[PDB]
UniProtKB/TrEMBL annotation:
Highest taxon of source: Eukaryota
Record key words, sorted: Signal
Residue intervals of the Ricin B lectin domain: 7-65
The protein, known as: 16 kDa salivary peptide
Keyword Transferase: no
Cystine bridges: C11-C143, C115-C131
Amino acid sequence: HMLAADVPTGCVTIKNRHEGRYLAHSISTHDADRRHVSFCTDPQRWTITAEGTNFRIRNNKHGEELFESQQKFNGNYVFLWIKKSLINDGGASWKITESGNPGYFHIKNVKFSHCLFTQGGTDWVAAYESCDTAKYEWRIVKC
């Protein structure tokens, strides 16, 4: 067996199936407490930690937690939390479950019940409730 049936924990890379690029921090900030998320061609490192049946996801480079926000453009924003105060309201907790395609997972926000999603060719990340196509599917591999 060479795949990881269980959700990989610790140091991982995170790659969207449709877009084919790696989830990454952004150079752009929405404010001094919220940094944006984007994609990169080269592998960018994250840290996944189990929290009960759920998971927290942290950007290795800046040490900031990934979370889904109340604020919304068209979709609900997905941010990195610059302040570093632990988020305890479900917004930074994620249900990571196998999709129908081997090695790919759905990453679903606990608070909002939205799956991480990207449009396609866009450096913008969001989360929506559909969770039914390749745009919602993520390959999670140990570093």
